[PDB]
């Protein structure tokens with residue numbers, strides 16, 4: 124069947140930002156018929172995944188618990204209420220949610236309406252390698268349906284992927300644990316070979332059978348009878364496909380592939396990618412495979428069989444993936460150094476702690492984080508990618524010297540250090556106070572993230588070249604600015620002094636002895652590196668359990 128069918132109505136609007144103007148180019152790439160042939164390898168992996176899913180017990184969320192997961196600026200319902208009414212448990216919001224739920228239990232077939240929209244994402248215009256990227260498309264149901272998805276499936280999508288995939292499930296790891304996983308897998312092989320597999324338009328490669336196969340896995344959970352019916356009805360009415368409506372309310376067409384804006388997008392994509400990849404590893408006869416899967420993002424670390432044999436087995440792996448309806452964008456390339464593998468737009472790098480001990484860390488090319496931070500500094504944005512980048516890439520030279528220096532001086536100037544901001548962590552929205560950054564970093568990356576030095580020449584040159592390309596002042600200017608930022612933060616005491624002393628310890632001539640922050644343990648990070656929720660409309664406010672008077 125065709126992934127999409129179009130009426131002809133436009134996808135109307137809601138260095139550079141992507142807009143609805145380029146929607147046509149995206150629509151052309153994502154529209155095609157899918158050819159899928161399954162085999163014994165696929166059926167075997169599937170049964171093994173289901174045997175693991177069978178250990179899961181999922182809870183039905185209450186209306187109140189589902190409403191509390193809703194982002195404050197989540198798109199309003201077409202039924203006379205918004206995200207604020209949902210979060211406040213307004214009678215009108217709650218009544219409509221209960222009627223949407225009742226309708227899921229009673230109606231098993233009528234397709235549910237969705238809105239199709241162009242995503243506005245910032246990228247860096249580089250005329251050296253082609254041109255501009257067309258806008259990505261987002262497909263999502265009404266607010267009432269999104270609350271019902273949480274009730275039926277939040278606990279499933281949060282618990283099931285790790286139980287099924289175990290250590291292969293990428294979203295259970297903090298950046299440091301991901302690095303630890305990849306390094307341990309690499310060191311465990313006699314002669315290691317790794318590769319990243321890039322599926323061309325993954326969401327569009329997802330068939331209605333893949334969506335039913337994914338439901339067959341959810342159905343292995345112990346579920347409340349209403350959760351079991353809601354999952355069944357949501358599968359047939361929403362997940363498998365349905366009609367598309369543009370921002371103007373016009374019939375835009377029809378979808379028979381993965382919706383990017385449903386609660387199950389990340390879980391379904393991870394399970395599907397893993398299933399197809401694990402089966403393709405058997406068909407390719409790859410030896411001692413270790414996989415790391417994050418939605419459509421796949422990395423495979425295996426045992427090398429020789430240079431020519433590795434190239435041959437990768438072409439065979441690709442053939443199997445293609446039969447399973449997952450053909451590649453860029454064909455996969457065998458790598459023999461762990462640092463050369465780009466996965467989830469990131470790579471492993473190593474540095475030293477204050478004692479000369481080696482520390483592995485996750486980094487990436489800083490162009491897109493710097494261009495997005497420049498955009499966010501220029502105009503008010505709903506999400507602060509700069510904050511999420513500081514959190515995820517805290518050990519990096521670029522996040523420490525540039526992002527921390529720039530943003531802490533702006534916050535000092537605006538007197539907004541305590542003002543909570545929204546950022547995305549594995550697709551989920553977190554409301555975080557910049558004053559909590561030292562404690563967050565210590566908890567995720569360890570105390571060493573504040574003492575890292577001996578960065579690699581390759582990483583230093585990538586950062587320096589990027590600063591030059593973007594007209595950003597060089598590293599020595601940042602060191603000078605961080606000294607003043609640090610002195611002003613130290614002068615304020617409390618959490619602000621801790622920001623100065625810990626985040627900017629790299630900036631001083633004579634480096635301080637840093638002891639662990641006592642209040643860091645109080646932070647409730649329980650929901651942090653559990654699962655992926657990209658397009659899942661998930662929100663959390665950072666909380667502190669058991670506060671001591673003196674902190």
Ligand SMILES: O=C(O)/C=C/c1ccc(NC(=O)C2(NC(=O)c3ccc4c(C5CCCCC5)c5n(c4c3)CC(=O)Nc3ccccc3-5)CCCC2)cc1
Pocket residue numbers: 138493494496497498500525526529593594595596597600
């Ligand atoms: O000794 C030497 O050899 C060099 C000395 C030297 C060179 C340039 C400066 N620049 C500045 O002072 C100013 N800009 C900056 O001090 C500046 C700060 C952050 C900047 C950023 C990002 C970096 C990440 C956080 C968000 C801001 C960008 N650009 C920045 C410029 C350059 C810019 O204007 N825009 C972009 C566009 C895309 C990406 C980055 C940038 C402020 C007043 C005058 C212009 C200062 C000193």
